[PDB]
């Protein structure tokens, strides 16, 4: 690790600076270095890790979709052959995306998840594991596509089971997990009815628990509840 010589606290400080500078590749590298110090992550640190890699892989996914769209048009009946270049460059971006996903999954497996005992940390990491298998699934086409999908499903399901036992229905981690597992059902598992059921039930159970919350907790929960509603509106 090229971050092995830097203090853990310095890596966290520089991750925050990189975020302010919109240098998310640097942010992710700093937070990978922090994880590799071997200590558990605090709540703030877990969110720095997720923000960094979400921004990195989000850009890769956007680029991959642009290139895949160009590639599909290039292979429509009537198009002018233009050689291997579109496929080659889509493959290049795809391989870099898979690399980032494998890096995140590696951090979760070595050893964030196994040391995570509290619901807020364990659900958070298992949600990440589902998310990064989901991004691998978006680009998968080979002998392993079904196994990648099932790895995402399995991680999301373990996270769901813990969240329903250990967190209130308005907990923002529980809500964001349900949001993303619902999108997994719709976009990856070809299960739109499951996606809609999950989003609606999550929204309704959260609504009924809002009365227990402070103003600041209410704002956090209703923000994610609006995303659930947004998707339901998209899908119905």
């Amino acid at each position: 690790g090229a971050m092995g010589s830097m203090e853990r606290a310095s890596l966290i400080q520089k991750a925050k600076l990189a975020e302010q500078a919109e240098r998310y590749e640097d942010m992710a590298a700093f937070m990978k270095g922090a994880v590799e110090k071997g200590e558990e992550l605090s709540c703030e640190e877990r969110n720095l890790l997720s923000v960094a890699y979400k921004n990195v892989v989000g850009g890769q996914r956007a680029a991959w979709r642009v290139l895949s769209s160009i590639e599909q048009k290039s292979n429509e009946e009537g198009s002018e052959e233009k050689g291997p270049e579109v496929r080659e460059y889509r493959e290049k971006v795809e391989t870099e995306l898979q690399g980032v996903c494998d890096t995140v999954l590696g951090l979760l497996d070595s050893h964030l998840i196994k040391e995570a005992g509290d619901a807020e940390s364990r659900v958070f990491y298992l949600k990440m594991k589902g998310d990064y298998y989901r991004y691998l699934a978006e680009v998968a086409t080979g002998d392993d596509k079904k196994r990648i999908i099932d790895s995402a499903r399995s991680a999301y399901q373990e996270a769901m089971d813990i969240s329903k036992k250990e967190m209130p229905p308005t907990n923002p981690i529980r809500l964001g997990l349900a949001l993303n597992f619902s999108v997994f059902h719709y976009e990856i598992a070809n299960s739109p009815e499951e996606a809609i059921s999950l989003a609606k039930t999550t929204f309704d159970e959260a609504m009924a628990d809002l009365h227990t919350l402070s103003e600041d907790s209410y704002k956090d929960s209703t923000l994610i509840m609006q995303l659930l509603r947004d998707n339901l509106t998209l899908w119905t």
Binding site: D131, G176, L179, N180, V183, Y186, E187, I224, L227, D230, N231, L234, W235
Partner: peptide, 5 residues
């Protein structure tokens, strides 16, 4: 695309 967080 749909919303994820």
């Amino acid at each position: 695309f749909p919303a994820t967080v």
